Each structure stands twice: as C-alpha cells, then as structure tokens.
Design a protein around this ligand. Structure first.
Ligand SMILES: O=N[O-]
Ligand SMILES: [Cu+2]
Ligand SMILES: [Cu+2]
Ligand SMILES: [Cu+2]
Ligand SMILES: [Cu+]
Ligand SMILES: [Cu+]
Ligand SMILES: [Cu+]
Lengths: 337, 336, 336
C-alpha cells in the first residue's frame, strides 16, 4: 500500500485495559484494514511481587506487568504512541515480535525520559506475539524487570481450527508470565533498593544463574487468585493467551485441557488438540482454547510444579455450573479401608 | 449416555504390571465402551537411587517409581480404587491429566493413611497422559518424590499415521523419567532421614534451585541398563511411552529414530516423523513409534547429555537380528 | 541396495567449508543416488570464547566449533573419512543422528590418536540432524567441548512447504550453538589449563550444575558479528540451520520471522509458519526459511535473553536494500 492509501484508511483509537482482561474487539474483522491507534505510558515503579512484600523496581508499559494486550486484525496497521515520562530514569523502546524491520521497532523507538515516539507497523502475520523493551546493552534487564507484554493479530475471518471450522470464544484472558531474579542477602532474605540502578549489578548476578527467584502471572505470586481469580461457566469457550518474553513455560489447566492450542502462537500453524500441557518457548506467546465442562476451582499453572507452587506460577479459575458425573464421579469417597 | 446406559456398561478388572512393562491390552478396542477397573496401593518407602547408596523417601503408586501404565480406549471409563495403608504417614491423592473436573480427580481422592477411595472418569480424549499425586500445598514435593505415572487412552480403532494408515506395535514400553532433589550436607554427601517429613525443608531448598541432583528412568540410575535393558528384534515395531510429571525432557534413541512421534502425547494431533530427538514438556507424556532396522545395543536417553550420562537419564535396548550393511557399514575399521 | 549396487553408484568428493558457511551443493538432487565423500581431521585445540580471554579445550571436527555442515540428499550414502592425528591426546568417534545402527556410527568409529576410519551410512530420512562425538563414559564432556556439528539431508526434489509448493533458498547459513562450562577460581576468575585432561574434573563439576557459563554461536561470544555477520538483501530467501547437541535453544530473528520453520528439523514433518520464536531441543537441529523484507541490522538470538545478551548467544545479519514504509514507519521520531 502507498502512503496515500494508508492515509485514506479509517482510524480507530483503542482504550487499553489491564491484564488479564482484554480491550473490546471483534473476532471477525469489521470492514477493511484500519489504522488501530494505541497509547502507552512507561512507568518505572516499585511493585510488590509476593505476600512477604518483596519489591521489584518494575519497568512497566501502561503501568502493569505484563503490559496490556493489543488486539488488531491481519493487515491492519498498529500505530503506537509510546511515552517515556520525565519522571523515569532510563531510556526505553519497544520491539514488537509481530512487526517487520528495525529490530521489531526497537531501532526506531528509543526514547529518553521526557520523550515520546509514534511507530506504525503492518500486522502482516496472524497470531499472538510478544512485545518487549530492548535497549541495546541492557536488553534482558528491562525484560526481566517486567517490561514486556503481547499482542494478538486475529485473522480477518476470526479463528478457525486446523480444518477450516470456525472457533468463536466467549471470553478471552491474557496471562503474562514473568521470571524475576531478586537479589538476596547473606540470610537469604530479599534485598530492597532505593533506585532501579542500585539493583542492577546484584540482579545481573542472579540472572546469570538462570534460576529465577519468582515465576509469576500478572506481576505477582497469587495475582490471579481470590477476588482476582479468572471466571468461567460450564459450556463457556475461553481463549487463554499466555506469553513469556524471556523464559520457557509449560501451561496446564489443572482439571481441564487445551482443546485447541496454537502452541507456537501463530494462527496459520494448525493448532495441537486435546492438550494436557503445552509448551511456549521464552520469547513467544501461545494461545489455548477450551470449553469448560465441569464447575469448581481450577488451577492454571506452569507445569514445572516447583515453578507453579514454590515460585509463584499458579492462577485460579472459578467455574459455575452443574457437575457432570458422566465425566467424573466419586464412586467411593475417601473412607476407612 | 443415559444413567441406565452407563450403569449397563460392562466392568472389567485389569491386573497391573510394573514399568517399563505394560499390562496386556488390545490396540483396537474389543467391543463397546467399558468401565475398566484398576487398584493401586500407595507405598511410602526408602529407595536407593544411585551407586553411592543415596536414599529417597519414595511415595510410590503401586510400589513403583514411576507408577504403572494403565491402558484404556477412548470413551471407556477408568475406575481406580486407590488405597493408602495405615502404615503410611502422609495424605495422598491422584490427578489424572486425562480426566475432566475436580483438579483431575485430586479434589475427590484425598485419602489419609488407613483410607481408600474409588474414582471413575470418562476417558474422552485419546493419548498418553501423566497422572500424579497432588495434595494441596505439597504438590511438587509428592511428585518429585516419585508419585507419578501415566495412562494411555488408545483410539478405539488403534493408532494411525497422519495419513490414516494403521500403526500397530509389536511391543510397548513405558519409560517414566524422574527428577530427584536430594539434600547434601556441607561436605557434598547426600543426607539420609528417618521419616519423609524430616526431609521436607531441606528438599524444598534443593527444589527451588531448579537443578535436580539425579534424573533417572524407572526410579534409579541404570534401572533400564545392563541385564534390565529393554529388548527388541530387527523388524519389530516398538512404542515407547515416556512421561515427565514435573520437568522437561528430550528423548532420543541413540542409533535409531522416532519414526512417528506424538510429541504432545495426543493421538488426534498428527505425529511428527523421522525424529532424532523429541521434546516432552514437564507435566506431559509423549509416545514414539519405531521399527528397529539394526541389531545391537542402543542407548535411549534424555539428550541433555549431562542429564543422561552424569545424572542418570540413560536406558539401553538390546536388539537381535541381522546387520544391514546398506544402512551402515565400516568401510575401514579404526586403524593406524 | 546390494553391495554390488552400491559399488556401482557415482562417487562425489566434497570439500567442506567453515561454519556458518555451507559447502557447494544443489537443492534438487543432481542425478540418482551417490556415495558422497567427506573427510574431517579432529583437532584438539585451545579456543578463546569471550573478550576476557576465557579458554576452552575444544575438541573440534575439522578444527572448528561447531564442526562443518555436510549436505547430501535422501538415499544418498554419506561416506566419512575421520582422522584422529597423532598430535591429539584422546580417543574420539562420531555419532550421526541421521544414521541407523551402531549408536549412529560411534560404535564403529572409535579412533585413538594416530588412527583413522571410514564409515558409510545411508541417509534414509530427510532433514537436518546433529552429529557429535560420544566416547563411552566420556560423552557429554566431548560434546560440551565443542565436538558436534550437523548435516542436512535434502529431499531429492529440494524443499517444499506443507502444501507441496517449492521453497528455494538463495543463501544458507549454519549456526551451531554451544553451551560451555568453564571452571572458575575462588575470585570468580575463569581457570586456564595446559592440557584437555587437566580440565576434566573441574569441568564435570560445572557441567553437573546444568548452568552453562557461556552459551555461544560458532564457538565464541560475538563470533557471528562484525567481520562474521551473516549477510542478505531485501527479497533474498535464506535458510538458517541451527543445532544444539546438548541443550535446548529458542532461536529468534530480531526484526524478522521464521516464515517456514522445520522446528523438529525433519522435512517430512510439515513446517510451522510465521514463527516469532521457535524451539530446538538439546540433541537436535532445526531449520528456518525467511525472505528478508527490510534492510538493516538484525540480531539472531537464543531468546532466553540472559543466554543471548549475558551469556553470548547472539549473532547479527547485515541486510542491504530499500526500506519499506508500508511494513514499518516512524510516524513521530523520538522527540520531546
Ligand atoms: O495437574 N496438576 O498439576
Ligand atoms: Cu524479542
Ligand atoms: Cu498435573
Ligand atoms: Cu546424540
Ligand atoms: Cu525499558
Ligand atoms: Cu502423594
Ligand atoms: Cu571426541
């Protein structure tokens, strides 16, 4: 398309919502290509990542870890206004794995505190894709400080299974998984720091062990539990988008399955089916579609169970509806032999 | 099906066999849906896992690490009687990844020592699937103490390739891979404990390093080597089911291939073909189909070779038959 | 085929080239099956792997880490003359994951210093495959000393997508990724040794932590950058072959994609498409096909960004051509 033709396209401004929720969108594209406009302000902020009060100096797109999910359709243009407020201390940028050129956009979006930039790219390939900050020489430090999220580029005709049958979800959640590397003192207690820069050297030492201290969804241990548990109902079709910008994960819905899983995250690659546990390599997003069949509490985990239950990578679903004894029944409840 | 229809299905009791062997079954389903009944007794016991006398307080379905492979067909029911003898000291349960609801069955099967339970679930999806104990708040500890196994839910018409051609194995083995995290004292010597709970805190410390001290098949270093090597013959078709309930693995048959590999373990997902090394993520089972073409000793490994040859994740196959010089020949033997 | 049939086949001698370049070959097979002849001399040599002067005692096929890429076509025979010069100190061999029998050839190729051997195998399965040394009892040590490479067995009709459309590359590069385990002294300084055997005990200790000190392409931090940046132009189709003989990796072309990725490395397994980041398990090779659409510098990385940018797993592409503002444009350049 020419500059003139792109200029002639409809514009749509989107208001982002905080994960695990996803902004209003249509599964099947409404009309022809558009320039879909997003704005995000980067916040360097102290966050608490567990119930003990362990702090991280997060580097957060839109003030959240993960950054929010942006949704467009194939061959739309995503136009992001990225703002680095003067209250921040570091240069930041953005690399969209969905985009083509200039290191995903990073080469064109290097912004110092007090600066902004506007990047447009054509979303040529359908799928869920990681985005993350990547300042040359400081790349993993920004990413493992939480400066990453994902986008979804839906096919214009919405989702389909591997064999051309339409798949329409009732709801969608975005689970961003974060590996954190928090320095410890000689007693093994987590250290606190005044400014982000003060933590750098100690943090790099931990990073180099390739062993995170915390592995979390939505920025903290237990973030998606209690009144923040995800919800569904028997019969409800749910898409769960999962990303990990730095490190492998292996998602699993305890008590359920991934009926269709685009484990590579790319919609032109046919989904795996009937999955127990799927695999998303570091630097990617994936997506799983499931129709709930049983009510009750589910845990959604990274199925390295140490990572899930010791390090933090467990979320909950609360599911309403009628129990199905055909699918599962307690023939004899726990009772004396 | 209706209530009366479910109640009217035949019930069949099947006797289990210790891994890597698999109980007798038919690849193509015999008759209509059945309620297939299994019983397992949980054993808490000390096992030695290496050549240095290193002990683990194993928590073992049916007395083995891994627990045995249960085989049913799609749309059968699996009905397990799980027994926790009063001589045990921990509560246990079971989560079948093959099952739908109540955390895979874990929510319905929490049995204290001296208790038993019977769980039935419909095996709605074909594939190999992990099962494991998962007492809330102590999940990974039970799993990495060896309390895990797998099941196979065969398609009612048996296995097929990506094009619909039948794939019929002559034999099947179940390799359960176990990551262990054994505490050491400050001199590097592995510690021993009187009771399982005594090891809890020290073990969780090792677990949190995400670095197993041992990675083993069938519960110990060298368990599937030497006189306990698996066997085959040239021309024989072998299915190798492999599980890892907690941690990634990358199986490889040294000297062979995975001709067809359901790497995700699910039979409705078409198998990869001609595989050198396949990948099974922690929390899953996979299955590889191979026709042996050469005789001799094979090694079957997790192809992180440090895990295989330093930490214990190596098995052998002993294969009989005639050497095929077309496939491979020594044109010049090692010579000065 | 019979011995007589094989003896009648055309022979072709190949001259290997150092990675990431690949020796001259045809994508579509030229004529019927051939016996394709290769020779490699093993060099035990010191390599410097980072800008701190850190040394590894490399065990290098053809003097490089990784060893060179050998290219044949399906149902060709690969005939390798492998030489262990008297200047070396250890026994070596070679295991081809592409091969069938005798542990991939390792059982037939054990050569002491001063010995040579000739192995012929039939390349029956199309794909990219790891090869590596594997001396019994010292396997991971040789592999993590850099004694590994890969081969490509092309389909006789060259590459195709999942739907039979031809895929023809203009350029091919071979990236061998290496995990190294370098001992450190009490001050955290990397240790140096004056013979490979001297380093064994200390190196095994590091290996057992499963935590590499370095993860590198082509034997060193920054190897495939600057003078060794890989090159292309807008419109050019490039195949990137990537191997890792011991440890998982997750390749990613920063600024680009894998348009078609044989993530398992096997050409009869249909390629994934539009990949951001693909996954290659330890013990395997994979291949990605991409058509460049934008000029400029790309980084090609293992997308565990700590592994890429702290441990060394980062390469560059330098791509010439015209910028495409339709695909990407700076609407507002960084400004107050
Ligand atoms: O599927 N329970 O980890
Ligand atoms: Cu990236
Ligand atoms: Cu589980
Ligand atoms: Cu190998
Ligand atoms: Cu940043
Ligand atoms: Cu248990
Ligand atoms: Cu060697």
């Amino acid at each position: 398309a020419t500059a003139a033709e792109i200029a002639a396209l409809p514009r749509q401004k989107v208001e982002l919502v905080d994960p695990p929720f996803v902004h209003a969108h249509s599964q099947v594209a409404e009309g022809g290509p558009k320039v879909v406009e997003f704005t995000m302000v980067i916040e360097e902020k102290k966050i608490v990542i567990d119930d003990a009060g362990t702090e991280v100096h997060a580097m957060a797109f839109n003030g959240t870890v993960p950054g929010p999910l942006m949704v467009v359709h194939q061959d739309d243009y995503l136009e992001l206004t990225l703002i680095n407020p003067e209250t921040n201390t570091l240069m930041h940028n953005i690399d969209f794995h969905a985009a083509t050129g200039a290191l995903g956009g990073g080469g064109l979006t290097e912004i110092n505190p007090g600066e902004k930039t506007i990047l447009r790219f054509k979303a040529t390939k359908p799928g869920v894709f990681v985005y993350h900050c990547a300042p040359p020489g400081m790349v993993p430090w920004h990413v493992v400080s939480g400066m990453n999220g994902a986008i979804m580029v839906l096919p214009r005709e919405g989702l389909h299974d591997g064999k051309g049958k339409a798949l329409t979800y009732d709801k969608i959640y975005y689970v961003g998984e974060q590996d954190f590397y928090v320095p410890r003192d000689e007693n093994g207690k987590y250290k606190k720091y005044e400014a982000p820069g003060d933590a750098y050297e100690d943090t790099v030492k931990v990073m180099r062990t390739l062993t995170p201290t915390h592995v979390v969804f939505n920025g903290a241990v237990g973030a998606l539990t209690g009144d923040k548990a995800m919800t569904a109902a028997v019969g409800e079709k749910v898409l769960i988008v999962h990303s990990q910008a730095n490190r492998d994960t292996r998602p699993h819905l305890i008590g359920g399955h991934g009926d269709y899983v685009w484990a590579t995250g790319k919609f032109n690659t046919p989904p795996d089916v009937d999955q127990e546990t799927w695999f998303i390599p570091g630097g990617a997003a994936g997506a799983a579609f499931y129709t709930f069949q049983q009510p009750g509490i589910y845990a959604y985990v990274n199925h390295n169970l140490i990572e899930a239950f010791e390090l933090g990578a467990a979320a909950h679903f609360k599911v309403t509806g009628e129990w199905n004894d055909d699918l599962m029944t307690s023939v004899l409840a726990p009772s004396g032999t």
